[PDB]
Ligand binder design. Sequence first.
Ligand SMILES: CC(=O)N[C@@H]1[C@@H](O[C@@H]2O[C@@H](C)[C@@H](O)[C@@H](O)[C@@H]2O)[C@H](O[C@@H]2O[C@H](CO)[C@H](O)[C@H](O)[C@H]2O[C@@H]2O[C@@H](C)[C@@H](O)[C@@H](O)[C@@H]2O)[C@@H](CO)O[C@@H]1O
Ligand SMILES: CC(=O)N[C@@H]1[C@@H](O[C@@H]2O[C@@H](C)[C@@H](O)[C@@H](O)[C@@H]2O)[C@H](O[C@@H]2O[C@H](CO)[C@H](O)[C@H](O)[C@H]2O[C@@H]2O[C@@H](C)[C@@H](O)[C@@H](O)[C@@H]2O)[C@@H](CO)O[C@@H]1O
Lengths: 297, 297
Amino acid sequence: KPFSVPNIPMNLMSNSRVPMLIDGMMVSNDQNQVPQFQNGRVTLDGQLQGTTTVSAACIARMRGRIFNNNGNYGVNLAELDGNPYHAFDSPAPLGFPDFGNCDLHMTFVKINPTELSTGDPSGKVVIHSYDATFAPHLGTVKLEDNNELDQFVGKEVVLELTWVSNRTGATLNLWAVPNYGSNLTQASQLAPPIYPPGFGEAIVYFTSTFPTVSNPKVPCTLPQEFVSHFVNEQAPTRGDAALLHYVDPDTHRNLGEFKMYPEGYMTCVPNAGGGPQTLPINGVFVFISWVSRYYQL
Amino acid sequence: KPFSVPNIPMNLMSNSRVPMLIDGMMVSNDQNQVPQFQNGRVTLDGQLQGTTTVSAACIARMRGRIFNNNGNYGVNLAELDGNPYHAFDSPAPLGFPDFGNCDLHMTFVKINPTELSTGDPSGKVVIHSYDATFAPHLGTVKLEDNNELDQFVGKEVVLELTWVSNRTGATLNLWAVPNYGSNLTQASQLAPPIYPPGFGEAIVYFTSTFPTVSNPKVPCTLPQEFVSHFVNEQAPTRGDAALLHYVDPDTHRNLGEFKMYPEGYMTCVPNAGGGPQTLPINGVFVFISWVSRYYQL
Ligand SMILES: CC(=O)N[C@@H]1[C@@H](O[C@@H]2O[C@@H](C)[C@@H](O)[C@@H](O)[C@@H]2O)[C@H](O[C@@H]2O[C@H](CO)[C@H](O)[C@H](O)[C@H]2O[C@@H]2O[C@@H](C)[C@@H](O)[C@@H](O)[C@@H]2O)[C@@H](CO)O[C@@H]1O
Ligand SMILES: CC(=O)N[C@@H]1[C@@H](O[C@@H]2O[C@@H](C)[C@@H](O)[C@@H](O)[C@@H]2O)[C@H](O[C@@H]2O[C@H](CO)[C@H](O)[C@H](O)[C@H]2O[C@@H]2O[C@@H](C)[C@@H](O)[C@@H](O)[C@@H]2O)[C@@H](CO)O[C@@H]1O
């Protein structure tokens, strides 16, 4: 099966870290910055990594049963379909937010049909993605008590990320990797860090405007629809890098060349006119050829 | 280009009317209730219909500027990327909820980056998908005043569907078509109603458990990832129907046949053999061939 990337304009695809349309590309201020996102992680031959899911419907969501232990509230986590999280494959349940060291402002609803016959099933809560009480790898996270959790104790809910704020005393760092928790000898299951290629190349980030307050631009290393595309195709990786063109949807003019590496990320060589950030956002990526990892952009 | 459907297990794909994993499929008990969903609508050759778009990140969301005029609040609608909604040109902005005659309980956030440097950008509001003031095709919907909208007047927000309840005096009808054009006009570019073809066939609905309170099972006529697949492929339609086999994900043994029609829905003959049988939810649809309308399931 021949390799390809989606024939969909970039601005119709979702961020892989929040369910939001992509509205830009950027390179990092520090071109040596190492991303280690846990969502949007897949190889070019379609092997999922981290907490990455096929569907954008799972991005930055949680599921589980709310508990109250001696005034300490929390969620006992499950996968989003309600089946148990076994921690065999991922550092947290699939889809789990990968924003670390910050305050996650969640909206949630009861999800058991028996709890959905009448009344308001909804609530909201803050979850800190820090401290030992944030241990999603071990199946539990602490909820901040907002005096409105008691009606939900013992109930199964699904939670979604509404907005994010900085932890007191810290900036909101969207490159931070959550400390998901360790379990004795068990593997972390983390998707690996991506080290910048150097030699003029820079990792390309796809961005979405989103209410990460104090830093309202969420970077990711692949659009979500690239992930499902690769999972669907399972195309053998026949070279060390894939040469892409980013093409005008109307004129079919090549607007810039990119390299995709087997690990599932893209680079460019930024030029005089600002890097990829200056490109129109309605272009279409097209696979041209397998090339050497040393191919010169 | 040969037609195909996604090679993704059903239970990893999203509903096309709410952003939730599919947890089953079923035929309706009321064969007389006609589906005319506006989301999840696409032809097999990749032509989007109604309010349907490509990404699951857009499903059941709204965007626009909150206003207060003549003693009532509302939203002036835009497309989800912030570009203008071309009023009178599709039934409503793409992704707009297609639940009619009910109460849409929305969660929202300010989306202008200048409004996202500090503070809580979030709120919630109820929107009635009924009355003359529900006029999304004209560019506006009324918001119910909850005494917490003032700070948002003049601000651009994105809204997401958190839960749904019935309109007072009515039952919650998940097959109702919203009156998008109010009393002014029938909305243009409505995706058409669907009727079963005969030969014992019944329309198949993909289901998700979701807080549509009083009926927490949301039916749709295609998985969202089927929609993006067809848009991506643009495969010409070459027969009356596309025969699909729903196969075991590991052995590829056929578990049941389905016929997909060019209008973008599928049928089955349910209850084959009196039926003390249940299909699993983790099968994979595989395109077998184009077949005539007379192909007997
Ligand atoms: C038994 C009874 O009449 N309870 C009402 C309550 O209605 C119940 O709960 C709602 C969600 C719905 O499932 C009803 O069928 C059910 O009887 C009222 O809730 C409102 O009900 C109307 C319909 O009659 C609308 O569905 C409306 O959106 C509902 O308000 C929402 O749900 C409420 C529980 C509140 O949270 C409210 O803020 C929401 O907007 C309420 C309110 O009038 O009063 C009784 O509890
Ligand atoms: C002006 C001011 O100091 N307001 C604070 C507020 O902090 C501001 O708003 C938050 C969201 C964030 O942008 C801060 O940088 C900003 O100074 C406080 O909010 C808390 O801020 C801490 C960080 O210092 C956390 O981010 C925390 O999650 C915030 O609480 C949340 O947002 C608040 C506005 C409330 O809505 C609250 O429910 C949220 O938890 C608050 C509370 O300490 O106090 C002032 O309002």
